[PDB]
Design an enzyme around this catalytic site. Structure first.
Site, mmCIF file in Angstrom:
data_model
loop_
_atom_site.group_PDB
_atom_site.id
_atom_site.type_symbol
_atom_site.label_atom_id
_atom_site.label_comp_id
_atom_site.label_asym_id
_atom_site.label_seq_id
_atom_site.Cartn_x
_atom_site.Cartn_y
_atom_site.Cartn_z
ATOM 1 N N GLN A 99 -28.072 -31.046 25.454
ATOM 2 C CA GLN A 99 -27.004 -31.554 26.316
ATOM 3 C C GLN A 99 -25.631 -30.981 25.986
ATOM 4 O O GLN A 99 -25.364 -30.592 24.849
ATOM 5 C CB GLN A 99 -26.944 -33.080 26.248
ATOM 6 C CG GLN A 99 -28.159 -33.781 26.832
ATOM 7 C CD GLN A 99 -27.959 -35.279 26.969
ATOM 8 O OE1 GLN A 99 -28.825 -36.068 26.593
ATOM 9 N NE2 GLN A 99 -26.809 -35.680 27.503
ATOM 10 N N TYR A 125 -38.208 -56.940 -17.482
ATOM 11 C CA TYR A 125 -39.603 -57.105 -17.075
ATOM 12 C C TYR A 125 -40.228 -55.736 -16.790
ATOM 13 O O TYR A 125 -41.404 -55.505 -17.087
ATOM 14 C CB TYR A 125 -39.701 -57.975 -15.819
ATOM 15 C CG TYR A 125 -39.662 -59.467 -16.068
ATOM 16 C CD1 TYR A 125 -40.482 -60.060 -17.028
ATOM 17 C CD2 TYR A 125 -38.871 -60.300 -15.275
ATOM 18 C CE1 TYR A 125 -40.520 -61.453 -17.187
ATOM 19 C CE2 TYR A 125 -38.899 -61.688 -15.425
ATOM 20 C CZ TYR A 125 -39.724 -62.257 -16.384
ATOM 21 O OH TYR A 125 -39.727 -63.621 -16.563
ATOM 22 N N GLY A 174 -45.035 -68.965 -13.811
ATOM 23 C CA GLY A 174 -45.978 -68.608 -12.780
ATOM 24 C C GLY A 174 -46.471 -67.193 -12.900
ATOM 25 N N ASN A 204 -45.143 -61.953 -7.888
ATOM 26 C CA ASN A 204 -44.783 -62.014 -9.307
ATOM 27 C C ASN A 204 -44.580 -60.689 -10.017
ATOM 28 O O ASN A 204 -45.308 -59.720 -9.781
ATOM 29 C CB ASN A 204 -45.809 -62.855 -10.068
ATOM 30 C CG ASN A 204 -45.995 -64.224 -9.453
ATOM 31 O OD1 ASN A 204 -47.090 -64.574 -9.017
ATOM 32 N ND2 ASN A 204 -44.898 -64.962 -9.307
#
Ligand code: F43
Ligand SMILES: C[C@@H](OP(=O)(O)O)[C@H](NC(=O)CCCCCCS)C(=O)O
Ligand SMILES: O=S(=O)(O)CCS
Ligand SMILES: O=S(=O)(O)CCS
Ligand code: NA
Ligand SMILES: [Zn+2]
Lengths: 548, 247, 442, 548, 110
Positions: free
Chosen positions: A146, A332, A444, A480
């Protein structure tokens, strides 16, 4: 001689690693740390500038009553404070995710059939090269058809491009090598043979859209952005009407029929589109990591590079930000890629398997699981008992559970050559660990580990799945920390031991064998260290369009 | 059929374009070969490519609709479906986008028409496309200054004209000859140079453009001044609004 | 007894089957054949036993280009298809004498499964069909070859794919005409998420049967969505009758009159004449050489216009033997009829609107595709409430081979299995029969 | 006197705005443009550095055969090339989205009820202040409880904080004013009274998470990150056990029971989580824009500031990137906030209505819709016919359709004081426009506009909805440019004319009346201009952690 | 009455409708049941509770025999009550969309 983690422990503490007692409370709190001091000073400046209190060491409890440890990035000699491995503070980690998020693989096979069958035009290695020059202008956000189009600033989108690969050497040879991922150059001989056989005469594009766009928007943008500029470039290069019926065929092929997303979309509770971390299966993550093609003589190195890739992505960015946030889950994850600890445990298991069975030569059964997983678990846990410095280093039970079980699962998979019995070993390790120390992980941690044993070999609807196909959206795994990256490692383990070129998807393996990526996927832990030192240069910065 | 409301010349022109029994005025003479050249889908003398076997060679299902609906010749032969696309200047081009699509589906069989602001397209089986394209190029559907055959890079419908009264074309597929006052097509509709240019004749003069145009404009006939046409559009709005609420 | 309307019902050859049928005898809520078709589509699953065997042999499971080296299993599944299917049926069935059907096709390469309706009577939705079928065949295969605990998870992957890591059954070797409930654009949309190509495949490209099945599904969804409740019920019932059921032979006769030389425009002229002839519309006002039409029954005008829309599609796309122009027909039939009459088009502009986006998204770079991949649940084509998609089904049935993503490409498994079911293949015949059966029950 | 767009047209072209003829082809193509010249040179540098061709002005068709225009940003005296208004090239536009994406509103009512009823502790303005100092340490990513936590660098996350507001003036006065959004300071008298009556004794947090996190992750991260650090700060400030049963109540309250997301999640085909642009209803967008509280005596200015906000976000970022990508939709959007064109049309309509009916004094019926929408539509279209330069400026039909109908719809809403009849006017404008010029927009522009008239007043399941509640996920609206931002303006229109403090949600209105936001929501178009000039400094940059 | 529709804290000023719904609950419930039922003798149940402040609705099982899932229950119930409330008070075409918002909320934007 020493265990592989001894140097790291020696660098952390004044005591020898074996010593049981130390001195606390007289270290000066946060003042012991260069990084926390930088943070305290920064917090004061930020608060003053904006007129709202921010970082303040006097809020809550006083950090640094114990030694605030340096961490060695495993396989490197770089030691940094843990804050330097937080994804927010580490540009290498952010760019690793951006490089995955902004990638899609799109076939040209359906597209070429539309050109020849519907349009009646010819496709040759020459037309493909022309198309590729066109799409490498268009893909970063520039126009081809274009009049009076406004375009993206080329320097802001310098990291966006399109390459192709094919199993046909002659055809690959005929295409301008600037656009080609050379399988014979990037992979060792036997691996290259396997990958070319998988791909065959298929031709595939690896599309990477701009990091700045991926950051402004989301992962689900990638396959759409890709499809738009593939569409324009097909119109331009093959002389369609700029918008006829056949144009819709190219759109459907590029968006649906021959697209490979890095991640599939997620259910409503964790609603996300494609190419977000939760949708990336463990097999894909193993194949995204490129350790397999450079470290193929060392299956432990390959498996643990995959663990590093996944621990960072799945725990720090995905679970620690996308799914929660705040201070998050740096340590972690770092447990799996620092201080050469997981390395020591996994090299032990590899040697055990090597001496007793030979790699991939154990029976694929429960007898092997009970043998290898139990032995490696006991080794790992004994190291924490023999070295009080190691236990104080990996102070959270979750972190020890993941590291010990990762070694146990990878080692079981080294023995059987099968990821599923490797997974069974991971869960057995958890059960033994729990009984040995009368603890495991956080509140958990073992939701999936208690469901684990029964769901390893289940065949029921939302339970049964080969480990390679599982991922962060497998129901038990959806929540977890301390599992997902380690599962990616276990997925890699049997394939690394077997010498397989890939784990789950050969197209994905080839797609990241690309020297034009910003992050170096052949040396993930090296890159993390570089980012920690503030020496990594990411894409997507706005410095060009902002004041000096 | 009545086709369209309104009492202006514009409204009548819209009705005329739609009415298959109204004979379009032929303004120029174009050869069969030059229509194929302008389309650019095949070379003159090249056999029609096929997208599927001839219908007579396929076992079509038992189907009353297939029996009752006569396929066009290109469908019987298995031709590709190709296109021709036009851009019409808002400065009084004779045909305009919606007028084209409405007229096409009144006049022509087996037609896929599409309307946009800067382009309008018809797609049908190749050999039938060639027949239709002759009519579209030779008649008052087309003016060589205020209209253009453009398969891409269509910019121009809303732009100011050049010194010769020609519409803008990024690829200049149609060139005005000051020596003849005639327009030549120098490229095909996708913008590739033609071996030999095609004569498209003279541009219509200002008075004739005014007589023939289907666009409403304040410097021509304004839409707001065709009150009966406006009344029907407002009626449609109201009846649609009420119908969506209740019956 | 709710409405006074009665229609004459015809077959797909244009012969009168049953005269003077109450409109409500065709309602999804009343007609037992529509009930049977909907309950059939809920409970029917295609199983590709050959695909499962090949996936296992090559360890190619879990999605496109995916393979796990070292996990290959060579099992003679197709060779033992009779025993495996029988074992599977024993788990799928509730009782020995229920409506469970398991039939081998293609020499055992495929299986048609119809899960017993008893399982759906105590289910919230329809997912029991693929899930019960999948696990029955997984267990049957494992039991047949005594596949070890260590390898059985591969059989699961070969059957159901990457689920549950993927939300969809990604890489599965079973198929249904419905998709998973998560993919609904809204509540009540399930019967709309059936690909046009699947409908055309199931009816074997019979144009009127494809139009019928599509209309039954679309209009039945309109009831589940609540759109055909209260004020709008009659309009939806009349739409079902005239557009999809060929009521009064209107579609058939418009096609007969315009098939040889006709266009969309000539179909419109005939339909407006017919509506005027039947007193559905009348001249409300005269302008300057222009008649403005009105109606005292918008629901019936809509029904007539909808029949003309279907006929215009069959004439226009039938002439081309190419489906792509259906988006154009749907647009300009409605655009032209409004300026021809002064009355609103089908679905009060909503078919025209759907057609505008449908045209765009079948001729552009941005999405969509060919006519065959759309459906009433597609974001592009969901907007008309049952009046647009049936025409797309008709158009695709008439296509002679111009489409890359044809029924052959997208719906091969659906074709082999779902076309075996008579009421899926010839829905018009059964719905007409049932409507006659309950004629004086309405 | 002059039309408001006249000066802009005079700046663009040599010719008088009324002249029908000009000169083409002799401008040097891309070389006429300073910006394109910058792009050509940058493309050379990029390709050279990376070894793959990129931006190349000679690919496809040659831009600049006509004049490549400057655009005036409406209400400013700033003229820029269109490329400077592409969201990728404009840091202001990116930060506007980031400021919305990284915001949630979270109540403290429930939370305080848990403290008093379950923990049995008292809540006072003093305890709230202590909580707020705690959460402003914690929210950016810093620790308050555990030992050996690693933290985010305070300077990287300086833009993250938590403030509160309440309708009770005396309680607001007792909380430390550094943390309070002062309704009486930010809003004019009458608006302040309305907003305070709406909120009452409720206390609400406005949480903003770090831009760098929002860019690394996604919108659905925001409410989760918010809740984690609200949770930690509740534990710390109110002396909970660090993880007891009551902690779960605070989690559920912050994540579900009293959270206000900026955007709701989207269905699978356009799968996205919360706080993505498609989930933001038009009423919220109008309320996020803060023009209402500064320009309250000019309802046109307020409405068009909302159109600017929505056109940019919905067309350029959402539809132009999230839902497609590439060069995108800059000028589809800029048509609504450049050259004072929409301003001219809308001031006409407001004057017409004010002169005939009086604002909000017209009957709320179809007669008013037919009158106002028709009159304004005819005015707008006449301007394109009278000024060839204006038609060449807004060259795409879609851009003219949106601008003309926006003026017609806003004006109709100015008359009735009701957004729904305003919406009816928008659709009527489209129908008239289509018949007048025998064209409207692009191929699929009027999907919603043909469905439009019947769906304005429908009450059916997925059809019926007040315009204020509609958004980018309303079925008809889910796909197409040139509507969504304009609808936001029409939503604002009747409320601006009425003098209402808010359009749909008072909490959202107050939440963005905050001087600590990076983007200035009181002057959206001014900010766009600042970004275009590369004078805007965004948050979230990685300069601090990368090589200098 | 408050124009508080479409979610928590949401309100459209100027759109308030003062309709005595609870006072006319019996008429509204009877009108709604006529639309919800398939036939006169079927198992449709509409029972007012709390003096007309609440209603128990059980959509006829015949609607679910020909449905893919269960969403017919809220959708059929919602539209029957929306239409019943509109018909009861002769709510204008211009205001009726507020009744729809009050019954079913921000769907389908949400
Ligand atoms: C290939 C298509 C079909 C399709 O699917 N999309 C296209 C092209 C696409 C490309 C063009 C980029 C490039 O040139 O490489 C992009 C930028 C989307 C993308 N991939 O980033 C676009 N269109 Ni388009 N597109 C636009 C427009 C338009 C107008 C242009 C009319 C004219 O006379 O110039 C027409 C539709 C119409 O007639 O109404 C149009 C068509 C088309 N549009 C025709 C090409 C027309 C041609 O051959 O020249 N766009 C507009 O009307 C204004 C805004 C403009 C967009 C860019 C921006 O907003 O800045 C652009 C938006
Ligand atoms: C239709 C749908 O595409 P698919 O048919 O699903 O491929 C949809 N695209 C869009 O709506 C893109 C919209 C913005 C680009 C066009 C603007 S007019 C999407 O990607 O989910
Ligand atoms: O203490 S909990 O186990 O709930 C969270 C561990 S980060
Ligand atoms: O030409 S199309 O209308 O399909 C796209 C406009 S950007
Ligand atoms: Na001739
Ligand atoms: Zn992002």
């Amino acid at each position: 001689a020493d265990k592989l983690f001894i140097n790291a422990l020696k660098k952390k503490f004044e005591e020898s690693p074996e010593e049981k007692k130390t001195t606390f409370y007289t270290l000066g709190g946060w003042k012991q740390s260069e990084r926390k001091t930088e943070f305290v000073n920064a917090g004061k400046e930020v608060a003053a500038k904006r007129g709202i209190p921010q970082y303040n060491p006097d809020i809550g409890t006083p950090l640094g009553q114990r030694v605030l440890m340096p961490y060695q990035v495993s396989t490197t000699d770089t030691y940094v404070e843990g804050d330097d491995l937080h994804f927010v503070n580490n540009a290498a980690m952010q760019q690793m995710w951006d490089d995955i998020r902004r990638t899609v693989i799109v076939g040209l096979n359906h597209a070429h059939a539309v050109i020849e069958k519907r349009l009646g035009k010819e496709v040759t290695p020459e037309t493909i090269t022309h198309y590729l020059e066109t799409v490498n202008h268009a893909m970063p956000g520039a126009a081809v058809v274009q009049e009076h189009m406004v375009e993206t600033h080329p320097a802001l989108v310098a990291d966006s491009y399109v390459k192709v690969f094919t199993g046909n050497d002659e055809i690959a040879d005929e295409i301008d090598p600037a656009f080609v991922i050379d399988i014979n150059k990037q992979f060792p001989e036997d691996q290259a043979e396997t990958l070319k056989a998988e791909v065959g005469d298929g031709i595939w594009q690896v599309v990477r859209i701009p990091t700045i766009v991926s950051r402004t928007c989301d992962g689900a943008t990638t396959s759409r952005w890709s499809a738009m500029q593939i569409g324009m470039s097909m119109i331009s290069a093959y002389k369609q009407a700029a918008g006829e019926a056949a144009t819709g065929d190219f759109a459907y092929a590029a968006k649906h029929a021959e697209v490979i997303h890095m991640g599939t979309y997620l259910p409503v509770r964790r609603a996300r589109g494609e190419n977000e971390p939760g949708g990336v299966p463990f097999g894909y993550l193993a194949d995204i990591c490129q350790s397999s093609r450079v470290n193929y003589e060392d299956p432990v190195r390959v498996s643990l590079d995959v663990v590093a890739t996944g621990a960072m992505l799945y725990d720090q960015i995905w679970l620690g930000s996308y799914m929660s946030g705040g201070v998050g889950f740096t340590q972690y994850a770092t447990a799996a890629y620092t201080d050469n600890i997981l390395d020591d445990f996994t090299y032990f298991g590899k040697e055990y398997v090597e001496d007793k069975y030979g790699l991939c030569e154990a029976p694929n059964n429960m007898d092997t699981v009970l043998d290898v997983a139990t032995e490696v678990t006991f080794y790992g846990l004994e190291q924490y008992e023999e070295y009080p410095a190691l236990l104080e280093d990996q102070f959270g039970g979750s972190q020890r559970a993941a590291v010990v079980a990762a070694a146990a699962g990878c080692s079981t998979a080294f023995a059987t050559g099968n990821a599923q019995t490797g997974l069974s070993g991971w869960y057995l390790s958890m059960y033994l660990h729990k009984e040995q120390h009368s603890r495991l992980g956080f509140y958990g941690y073992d939701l999936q580990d208690q469901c684990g044993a029964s769901n390893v070999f289940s065949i029921r609807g939302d339970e049964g799945l080969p480990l390679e196909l599982r991922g962060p959206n497998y129901p038990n795994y959806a929540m977890n920390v301390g599992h997902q990256g380690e599962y990616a490692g276990i997925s890699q383990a049997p394939h690394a031991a077997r010498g397989d070129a890939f784990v789950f998807n050969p197209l994905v393996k080839i797609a990241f064998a690309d020297d034009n990526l910003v992050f170096d996927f052949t040396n993930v832990r090296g890159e993390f260290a570089k980012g920690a030192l503030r020496e990594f240069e990411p894409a997507g910065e706005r410095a060009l369009i902002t004041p000096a | 059929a009545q086709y369209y409301p309104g009492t202006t010349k514009v409204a009548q022109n819209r009705r005329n374009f739609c009415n298959p029994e109204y004979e379009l005025e032929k303004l120029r003479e174009i050869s069969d070969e030059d229509v194929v050249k302008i389309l650019g889908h095949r070379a003159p003398g090249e056999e029609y490519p096929s997208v599927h076997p001839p219908l007579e060679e396929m076992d079509e299902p038992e189907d009353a609709i297939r029996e009752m609906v006569e396929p066009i010749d290109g469908a019987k032969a298995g031709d590709r479906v190709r296109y021709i696309q036009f851009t019409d200047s808002m400065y009084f081009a004779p045909a305009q986008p919606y007028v084209r699509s409405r007229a096409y589906l009144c006049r022509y069989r087996g037609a896929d028409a599409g309307t946009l602001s800067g382009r309008q397209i018809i797609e049908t089986r190749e050999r039938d496309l060639e027949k239709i394209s002759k009519e579209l190029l030779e008649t008052e559907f087309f003016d060589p200054a205020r209209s253009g055959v453009r398969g891409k890079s269509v910019h121009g419908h809303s732009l100011r004209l050049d010194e010769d009264g020609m519409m803008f074309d990024m690829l200049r597929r149609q060139i005005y000859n000051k020596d003849t006052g005639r327009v030549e097509m120098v490229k095909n509709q996708i913008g590739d140079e033609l071996d030999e240019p095609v004569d498209l004749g003279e541009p219509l003069d200002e008075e004739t453009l005014m007589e023939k145009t289907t666009i409403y404009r304040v410097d021509g006939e304004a839409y707001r001044d065709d009150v009966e046409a406006v009344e029907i559009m407002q009626r449609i709005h109201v009846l649609r609004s009420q119908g969506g609420f209740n019956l | 007894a709710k409405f006074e309307d009665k229609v004459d019902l015809y077959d797909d050859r244009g012969n009168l089957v049953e005269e003077q049928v109450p409109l409500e005898a065709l309602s999804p809520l009343r007609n037992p054949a529509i009930k049977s078709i909907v309950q059939g589509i809920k409970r029917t699953v295609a199983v590709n036993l050959e695909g499962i065997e090949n996936a296992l042999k090559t360890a190619k499971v879990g999605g496109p280009a995916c393979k796990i080296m070292g996990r290959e299993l060579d099992l003679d599944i197709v060779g033992n298809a009779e025993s495996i299917a029988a074992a599977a049926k024993e788990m799928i069935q509730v009782t020995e004498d229920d409506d469970t059907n398991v039939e081998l096709l293609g020499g055992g390469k495929r299986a048609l499964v119809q899960v017993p309706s008893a399982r759906f009577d105590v289910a919230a939705e329809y997912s029991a069909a693929p899930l019960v079928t999948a696990t029955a065949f997984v267990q049957a295969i494992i039991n047949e070859f005594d596949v070890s605990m260590y390898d059985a998870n591969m059989v699961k992957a070969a059957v159901l794919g990457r689920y549950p890591q993927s939300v969809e059954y990604m890489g599965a070797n079973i198929a249904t005409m419905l998709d998973i409930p998560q993919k609904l654009e809204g509540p009540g949309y399930a019967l709309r998420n059936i690909m046009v190509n699947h409908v055309v495949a199931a009816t074997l490209k019979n144009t009127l049967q494809a139009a019928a099945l599509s209309t039954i599904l679309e209009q039945t969804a309109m009831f589940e969505m609540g759109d055909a409740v209260g004020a709008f019920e009659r309009m939806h019932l009349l739409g079902l009758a005239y557009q999809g059921m060929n009521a009064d032979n209107l579609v058939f006769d418009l096609v007969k009159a315009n098939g040889k030389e006709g266009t969309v425009g000539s179909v419109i002229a005939d339909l407006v004449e017919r509506a005027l002839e039947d007193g559905v519309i009348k001249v409300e006002k005269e302008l300057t050489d222009y008649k403005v039409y009105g109606t005292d029954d918008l629901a019936m005008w809509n029904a007539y216009a909808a029949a003309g829309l279907m006929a215009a599609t069959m004439v226009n796309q039938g002439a081309a033997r190419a489906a792509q122009g259906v988006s154009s027909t749907l647009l300009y039939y409605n655009d032209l009829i409004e300026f021809e009459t002064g009355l609103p088009s089908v679905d009060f502009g909503k078919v025209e609107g759907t057609a505008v986006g449908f045209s765009f998204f079948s001729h552009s770079i941005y999405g969509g595709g060919g006519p065959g991949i759309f459906n009433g649940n597609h974001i592009v084509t969901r907007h008309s409430k049952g009046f647009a998609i049936p025409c797309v089904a008709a158009a695709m049935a008439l296509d002679a081979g111009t489409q890359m993503f044809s029924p052959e490409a997208t719906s091969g498994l659906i074709k082999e299995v779902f076309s075996q079911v008579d009421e899926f293949r010839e829905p018009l015949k059964y719905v007409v029969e049932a409507a006659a059966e309950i004629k004086n029950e309405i």
